[PDB]
Design a protein around this ligand. Structure first.
Ligand SMILES: [Zn+2]
Lengths: 96, 107, 96, 573, 7, 105, 96
């Protein structure tokens, strides 16, 4: 059931489907003919998102799905200074 | 590569997009990796240096959709006495293709 | 809750489990995704051999060092031709 | 709720906090991302890091390309101008200097520069930096009138319809006529080569020029022409411009029935396409408040002007000429509304803040002071005569004398001696000298205003009625010349009753003056009958006071374009 | 009050 | 008035001339500077010989494309009694490559 | 009546002497031993000033001499951004 995020350099980033559906872009790429070829996992490919930032994207997916509408005070996402801008380019493209 | 603005040529990327966009509509099969890479092509056209090609992409997508609907119209109108069933099949194909297209052109 | 980044070579599967949960059900999670028997693989918790039993609470990590925004990595490896391959978890990428 | 912050919005905060090390790489971002980093720098109070990037033409050019977030851009740009950095003049100078170097380049670079100049000059015109938008549009016009090609006349006249706009707002009316002539010259060259361009925008801006110069007789003809040149394919902004400026040109020529149609259609179109929080919708609200002010619907004009100001304080910031115009218009409207009540606290607050902005962003000799000062010098009069003190009264009248004298000097410098604005300043000075107990100078200024308003505007107009009201209030209540005061009251009541029906506000001032006139000489039958007329006036006013708010009075889609225009044009005969 | 408003 | 840069190989005469003046006066200026006969001087306006009969205004030089700020170049060649020589104007130099700051890198 | 402003590259810029004395430094270099050159036109070596910027210097000479005490409005000198820094140091050294 978990989707299959693939980075630019071939790293596999299996994350829960409900976690990846928090981003509208993956919501689009999984739909359409992306849902025509289905196996035990849903494969989505990012040819220009490096692994060091797609890992943080998946971390944000987990962080966002766990802290959705929770009364506990939410700490900020710890974005490293070296990977900020790239993640900012990964956040717009993924609409997350 | 990277998710940065690049000096991209609109013609080659648009042709790679066209080969897939003509098959997204009318429920033709495309490769899942190809469908995933077309999203990167859409993004690259929308962030191209020195001017965004989103205006050109929008104009060419509208032109392609108009041309496809006119071709489909000349395919359905010339066959009378069965325009209802042919229209139904065409509308089912075009509706699912248009939903998948709005998924593709989401950026 | 406790969040994990079970990683083998390129695969970087993201999992979650309770603090009171044990180590064994992690392989049960892996069965429904990687299609492998549970005894076929173990976990390299900080490149060190981990027992099949025990529990995640005293395993060396808790809810404070395994936040969803920065989950603790866990190694993993298979058996290939009557021998077990050593872990080769590569770093994701070098930030620019 | 406690929603987690978006990874886009969270990475903006991380990138901004690492702004110094990544200054060069933020320029290498998509246009939507690059705005949000700069808007976060504005939101974080780091205006000097923001101002070091907005001083550059080409960084600001990509920031300008985010059309949806133009209100945020206007707010942060006004914050930079209030910060102290002169980004409006820096960008204009940078555009002119970088744009004069490609005079001999190919057509692609030239048209790219013209497009960038249109975007930047349109921003500076919407932001209110007309002196800093004239240079941009002058450079654009310079590059359009270089090659003898077909599309260059179109771009040249599109430059000239915006030079005439940024010269009316800058009160450079003497360059406006020559700008119109030069635009008409390129329209002639377009017509010779079989390419007729739309003349609605230029004729509208010429109408605004002539209304500002108090040439309402010719401005009405030019707004007729502009409304004739409205087609269906025009941009909505141009149609709204022509409608609001034609409505202002109709309400000043006592065409109240036409003016309400034009201005309500303009307000509906502005609220439809743009929205309820757009600067252009605020412009339409200002002109609609001008209408409501000029048709005695003062109470709705106050709420309409406050709606215009609240939009202009939202999109823009502090020391801006658009907020200043909204203030000087609301201050006068509140002065009119609370003239009988005497509570000039909001009116003085808006008049003082209007001058506090124009004196900060405009030179001391600019004409835009002459309006605002006038408004303050009205309000400061009424507070002084309401105050029982003599020292405060004398000081406030001296200050109002200074403001009226400066406004009249500006009117002499720009408009001349025989202008309607000069006549307004003469009437105000006559009112002041009546309050200053300088009776001879009061009647001299009043009669000079009478002469100027009668020979230029005409005998049957609102302004001459108000001025004869002032003159015979001086004669009756103060100067004790009871003979001609009767004639001037009869003239004033005749014009007011014929122009605004029986519910004109100045009718009660004229009636009280006439009752005092008679009671000082007898003839108690006249006193009794005119007391009855005044009682009827009070019975009519409170009946018509209960009218719904003017924001929803225009409703949602009551009529349509080319129906308001046709209804305005077919009845011109 | 004796006069009207100012122009 | 028209302003020119008469360039031959590396020399660059920053002279001025009248728009109504002819090529003969310009060749006489080059007489006054490089002490060479006009018969050994063939002037090129972007690979185009200027006949001695015509004026500077006719061949293309005007007071708008040859301003004192940016004078318009004109070629020069010397005969040396052997079938003249081709134009060999050597470009000045390359200013240091100052890249566009907003280029993505 | 003419001087030969030889640059570092080798491009001689034969400009009028009256144009050259716009700059104080060239006037100094043409005074003393610099005026002793008997071969008519004086050569002023500029081994620190490249040719592409000395050409703009000579254009400025012919610009300021022709536009001095002008009754009409005067245009700014067209100076390219990629040469502006080099022509700034050339303007200081020449004091023009
Ligand atoms: Zn600052």
């Amino acid at each position: 059931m978990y989707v299959k995020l693939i980075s630019s350099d071939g790293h596999e980033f299996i994350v829960k489907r409900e976690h990846a559906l928090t981003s509208g872009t993956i919501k689009a790429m999984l739909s359409g003919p992306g849902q025509f070829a289905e196996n035990e996992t849903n494969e989505v490919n990012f040819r220009e998102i490096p692994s060091h930032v797609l890992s943080k994207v998946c971390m944000y997916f987990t962080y966002k799905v766990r802290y959705t509408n929770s009364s506990t005070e939410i700490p900020e996402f710890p974005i490293a200074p070296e990977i900020a801008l790239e993640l900012l380019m990964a956040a717009n493209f993924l609409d997350c | 590569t990277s998710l940065k603005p690049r000096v991209v040529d609109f013609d080659e990327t648009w042709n790679k997009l066209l080969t897939t966009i003509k098959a997204v509509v009318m429920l033709e099969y495309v490769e899942r990796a190809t469908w995933n890479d077309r999203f990167s092509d859409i993004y690259a056209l929308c962030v191209a240096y020195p001017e965004p090609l989103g205006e050109r992409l929008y104009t060419e997508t509208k032109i392609f959709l108009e041309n496809h609907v006119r071709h489909l119209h000349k395919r359905v109108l010339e066959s009378e006495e069965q325009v209802l069933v042919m229209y139904h099949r065409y509308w089912e194909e075009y509706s699912k293709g248009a939903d998948y297209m709005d998924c593709l052109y989401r950026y | 809750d406790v969040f994990l980044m079970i990683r083998r070579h390129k695969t970087t599967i993201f999992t979650d489990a309770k603090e009171s949960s044990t180590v064994f059900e992690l392989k049960r999670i892996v069965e429904g995704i990687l299609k492998r028997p549970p005894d076929e693989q173990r976990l390299y918790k900080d490149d060190q051999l981990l027992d099949d039993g025990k529990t995640l609470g005293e395993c060396g990590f808790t809810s404070q060092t395994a936040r969803p925004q920065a989950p603790a990595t866990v190694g993993l490896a298979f058996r290939a031709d009557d021998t077990f391959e050593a872990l080769c978890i590569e770093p994701f990428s070098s930030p620019p | 709720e406690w929603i987690p912050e978006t990874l886009y919005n969270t990475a903006i905060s991380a990138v901004v906090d690492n702004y110094i090390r990544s200054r060069r790489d933020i320029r290498s971002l998509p246009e939507n991302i690059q705005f949000d980093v700069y808007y976060k720098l504005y939101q974080q109070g780091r205006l000097c890091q923001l101002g070091s990037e907005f001083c550059e033409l080409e960084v600001f050019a990509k920031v300008l390309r985010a059309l949806d977030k133009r209100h945020l851009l206007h707010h942060c740009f006004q914050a930079l101008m209030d910060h102290g950095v002169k980004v409006a003049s820096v960008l204009a100078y940078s555009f002119s200097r970088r744009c004069s170097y490609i005079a001999e380049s190919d057509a692609a670079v030239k048209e790219k520069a013209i497009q960038v100049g249109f975007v930047l000059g349109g921003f500076l015109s919407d932001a209110g930096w007309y002196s800093d938008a004239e240079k941009v549009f002058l450079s654009c016009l310079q590059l359009c009138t270089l090659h003898d090609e077909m599309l260059h006349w179109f771009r040249a006249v599109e430059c000239c319809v915006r030079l005439l706009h940024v010269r009316n707002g800058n009160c450079k009316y003497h360059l406006g006529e020559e700008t119109f002539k030069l635009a008409q010259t390129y329209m002639d060259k377009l017509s010779k080569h079989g390419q007729q361009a739309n003349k609605a925008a230029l004729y509208g801006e010429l109408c605004a020029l002539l209304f500002a110069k108090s040439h309402y007789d010719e401005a009405y003809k030019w707004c007729i022409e502009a409304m004739k040149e409205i087609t269906a394919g025009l941009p909505v902004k141009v149609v709204v411009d022509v409608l609001r400026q034609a409505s202002k040109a109709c309400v000043v020529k006592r065409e109240f029935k036409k003016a309400e149609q034009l201005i309500k259609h303009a307000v509906y179109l502005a609220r439809d396409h743009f929205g309820s929080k757009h600067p252009k919708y605020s412009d339409t609200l200002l002109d609609y408040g001008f209408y409501l002010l000029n048709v005695d619907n003062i109470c709705q004009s106050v709420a309409i002007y406050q709606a215009a100001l609240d939009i202009r304080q939202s999109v823009f910031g502090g020391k801006n000429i658009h907020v200043a115009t909204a203030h000087e218009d609301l201050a006068y409207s509140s002065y009119v509304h609370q003239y009988s009540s005497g509570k000039f606290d909001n009116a003085l607050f808006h008049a003082e803040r209007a001058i506090g902005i124009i004196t900060h962003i405009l030179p001391e000799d600019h004409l835009l002071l002459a309006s605002s000062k006038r408004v303050k010098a009205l309000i400061l009069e009424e507070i002084a005569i309401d105050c029982h003190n003599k020292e405060t009264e004398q000081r406030l009248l001296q200050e109002a004398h200074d403001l009226h004298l400066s406004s009249l000097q500006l009117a002499k410098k720009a408009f001349g001696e025989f202008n309607v604005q000069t006549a307004k300043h003469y009437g105000n000075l006559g009112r002041l000298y009546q309050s200053m107990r300088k009776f001879k100078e009061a009647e001299e200024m009043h009669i000079k205003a009478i002469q100027i308003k009668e020979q230029l505007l005409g005998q049957e107009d609102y302004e001459v009625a108000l001025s004869v009201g002032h003159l015979a209030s001086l004669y009756n209540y103060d100067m004790n010349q009871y003979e001609n005061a009767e004639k001037l009251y009869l003239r004033s009541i005749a014009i007011g009753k014929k122009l605004f029906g029986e519910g004109y506000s100045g009718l009660e001032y004229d009636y009280r003056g006439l009752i005092k006139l008679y009671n000082s000489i007898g003839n108690y039958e006249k006193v009794f009958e005119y007391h009855n007329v005044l009682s009827n006036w009070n019975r009519l006013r409170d009946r018509q006071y209960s009218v719904t708010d003017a924001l929803e009075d225009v409703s949602t889609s009551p009529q349509s374009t080319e129906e308001v225009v046709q209804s305005f044009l077919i009845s011109q005969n | 009050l004796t006069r009207n408003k100012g122009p």
